[model samples]
Structure formats: structure tokens, C-alpha cells
Target: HCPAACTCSNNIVDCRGKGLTEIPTNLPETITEIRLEQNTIKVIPPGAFSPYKKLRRIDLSNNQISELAPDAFQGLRSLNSLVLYGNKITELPKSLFEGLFSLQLLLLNANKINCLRVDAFQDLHNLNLLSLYDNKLQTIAKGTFSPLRAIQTMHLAQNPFICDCHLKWLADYLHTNPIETSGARCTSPRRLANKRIGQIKSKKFRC
Candidate 1:
């Protein structure tokens, strides 16, 4: 049975712009995609999608989400794409994306995210695209994206990044890897300001 005011067809649930305050329950177990964008959702509790083992895509963009339970997306093994852009998230707890082994595309841009724990992306090994543009990030902890072995492109533009010795790894990563990026510029150290992270020399990243 479909949730009230939502349309369900061919294993896809369309709930965009429903003005809902929280996630809808009692969805079809076989559904593969669910669209919940442009709503008033503020929080995502743990195990919110645990029952949907077959789920592959979840779009929760343009919501008011700020607090996310550590295990909010736990047990979504088959999930491939998760869209959480345009929200109020400020930090990514270590266990936020645990167990999403098959995830390939993760969109987290246009939010208020400023802090990302070292192990925040520990489980996204197969992730191909990651978007973190237009956020409030300054410095990312070391080895935060080390687990993304299959990553191809990343959006790190528009954020106020502090270019110091601590951020050398990211510059090194971009130098050695053939990853595509845009607007990954430094916003600190009078001389390094406005310089792209990939173009700065290693010696210029002194603390």
C-alpha cells in the first residue's frame, strides 16, 4: 500500500514536495527509489530505511535536516545513490554512512557542513562521485577520503578552505590521482589565498 498522498508505481515512490515533516512509513518493501525532496524533514532517525532492503536510491534534498542519527542509514547495503544536498547539516558523525557498501554517487553539496570526522566516509569504497561544494568546510581531517578507492570526481568548490600543512594530503592526492575537480581554492595564508589546491606546491603548505 502507498503512503497517503504519495504515488507508487513500478517500485518507485514519488513524495516530492509533500510538505511532510518526517519520513513516511509503511512503504512497499520492493521499492527501489523514493523521492522526498523539498519537504520540511529536519531529522533522520536510526534505521529509518532498514526495512527496505531492496532500496537503491533515496533523495532527501532541499529539506531542513540538521541532526542525523549516527545509524540513520544503517543496513542499506544495496543502496547506490543518496542525495542530501541543500540542507542544514553541519557535521557528519562517524557512523552516519556505515553499511552502505554499494553506494556509488553521494551528493552532499549546498549544505552547512563544516566538520567531517576522519571515518565519516570509511564505508564508501565504491563511491564514484562525491559533491561537497558550497558548504562551510575549512579543513578536512587526514585520511577522510582514503577509503574511496573508486572515486572519480569530487566537487570541493565554493567552501572557505584553510590551506595549511594539514591539507597537504588532499593536494598530494589530487596530484597523484586523475580526479576532476572545480573551485578547490585556498582561502587562507595571505600569499596562498585564491590559489587552487591542486596548483599549489607541497612546500607552500607550511603550517
Candidate 2:
């Protein structure tokens, strides 16, 4: 007996659609990607993904998830990319990417993440693009990007980022990146939102 809609293929994976509240079966180790884009999965079971170490991408987008387990990605060193967009995640575990050293391109847009831990990306050395658009992240730490030397671009737009010392460092770092784009600016916030980061500091300030 199963939900209104659930299907498993090749014994390597399972898919339940139409009438399912959460993942109903365990997947084989060979399963690489899981797609449950539109569901009612409010939370993930502990170790639900421990068996899918070879899993690279899990499309749980457009769900009602409010929380994620810290060990949700445990032992999945082979796992690289993760997509958690269009959810209610307020914060991510700082060690979420501990085992995913090759992780790159994290899409954190369209969520409720208001703040980020400073050392959140200390282990992801190969990380390149970090998409944080439309989140609530206020600012980035100065040394937060020390470990990510391969980062080509980091998105901090559409966030509630406040322009201050925290933002100043980010502004400075942007100028150093090969992208050649401007840093966080104060716009439409009616305070300093309209101010450009480059205008606040002198050219000799490294930004």
C-alpha cells in the first residue's frame, strides 16, 4: 500500500506524486538525483539521505519545508550541488557543506534566510557561484571568503543588506574579484540605500 501517487524505477529510486506528504521509500546507493519539486514535505526524516551518497542533486524546490536537518547531507562527499530554493529555510547549518568539498553553485534565492554564519563556507574550496538573491542576509563577513579561492562570483543582491562596516568589506572584496562588478549599495531603503559603496571610501582603501 502506498500514497495516491508513488513510483519506483529500477529499484535504484522511487517517486511518489499526486498524493504524497513526504518521501515514502528509501533510495538505492546508485540514485544520483531526486526530484520532488512540488510536494508537501515540511521536513526531512533523519538519515533520509544517508543512503544516497552518490546523489548529486535533489530537487525539492517549490515545497512547504520549514526546517532542514543538520545531518541531512551527511556522508555525501560525492554530493556537490544542492538546490533549496523556494522554501522557508531561515538558516542553514554552518557545516552543511563540510563533506562536500567540491561543492559549487549554491542557489539560495527566494528563501527566508535572514542571516548567515561567518564560517559557513570555510570548507568549500572549489565553490564558484553563490546565489543569495532575494534572501534576508544583511551582510557578509570579512574573512568569510578566505577559504573560497575559486569563487568567481557571489550574489548578494535582493537581500536586506545594511550598508556599514560589514558591507564595506564586501564592497572592497568585490573590486578585487575578476568580475569587475560593484558592491552592495543603499537603494530605496530611504536611509543609506541610495549610496554607492565605492563613493564612501577612497580609491586607496582597496575597494
Candidate 3:
């Protein structure tokens, strides 16, 4: 069911940068990978990929998408990696990822996300890598990231962090958890300016 000019090879549908404004309607159900990045497409309707149960990786990065239905990712039970960077998503809606049990890598680096609810990622048991850099995050609660137990590498840099006592948990988590923290430099409170989150001393972080 490949569309014109879009090639399908070995269960992969290469339709990236195709200048299409919406999800193609003729994708084959046997496809396991779909790349739709660098397009002007916006909005992901519910059951967008319900027909593609074997889909594993889908890249919608660099798109103009700003809205997603609660069940936008309802199907595609085997999906693992989801890339949504360079979008306008401002909030991490809960239940948005409820059925994605096999999801592992989530890339949301370049968006407008300012805050994430504690239960935003409740059912992703296999998640390992997350990228939240180049956004508007200030601080996240202590247990906000406890759901992803298998997380090993994270990128929380290039944002505006206040670096107050509320952020001490992240610092403590960084030290004790031993996750690969990347570019988590501070940008607030003057005294700890320009210092990476791992580099900040505990004594100086007193209230």
C-alpha cells in the first residue's frame, strides 16, 4: 500500500520530508517503521496508527504538531521509540501514553514543555532513554521521574532551571542513581550560575 514516490522496503515506510500535511491514508499494515519527520503536518488524531500493529518506531519530529488527542497513540502495541522533537507541545498530558508498554526511547528535546505531571508517563515500563533539552522546564518534583525505572541516559540541558531546594532532589538523584546526565547546567540563583547540576555542592545548596 505504498504511496507514489514513497518507498517501502523490509517493513519500513520512508515518507519523511514528503511535504504532506496529514498522515497518509494508504500505509500498509505490515510496516514496522515509519518516518514522517521534517514536515508541516500538525495534529495527531485518535487511533492514528491502529492499523499498524506491527509498527515499532515512528518519527514525527520537526513537524508543526501542537495538539494530540488523549488516545492519539492508542494502538501500535509494539511501538518502542517515539520522536516528537521540534514541536509545540507545551504539556505532557497524562494517559497519552497509557498502552505503550514497550516504549523505550522518547525524544522531546525541542518543545515548549514547561512542566510535566508526575503521572504523565505512568505505564512505560521499558522506557530507558529520555531527552528534554532546549525547552522551558524550571523544576520537576522528586518522584516525577520514578516511573521510568529503567532509564539510564537523560538530557535535561539548555533550559532555565531555578536551582533552588526543590531541585536538590534531582541533584541527589543524579548522584545516587548514576544515570548518564548530560548538559544539565544551571541558569539561575546567580551563585550557582553556569555550574552543571552534578557539579553543584550539597553544602552550598542550603536554603
lDDT string for model 1 (14-44, tens) is 9899888999988988989999999999998
lDDT of 2 by residue, 76-118 (tens): 7766677777778888865766667767767777888877787
Write down the TM-score for model 1: 0.96
Off by over 4 Å in 3: none
Candidate 3 per-residue C-alpha lDDT over 18-81 given as tens digits, one digit per residue, 9 for 90 to 100: 8878877768879899888888888887778778889899899999988887777787568999
Scored by TM-score, the top model is: 1
Give lDDT for model 2. Answer: 0.67
Give each model's whole-structure lDDT.
0.89, 0.67, 0.83
Runs with alpha carbons beyond 4 Å of true place in candidate 2: 1-19, 178-184, 187-191, 194-207
Cα RMSD of predicted structure 1: 1.1
Q: List the residue pairs that clash in candidate 1.
A: none
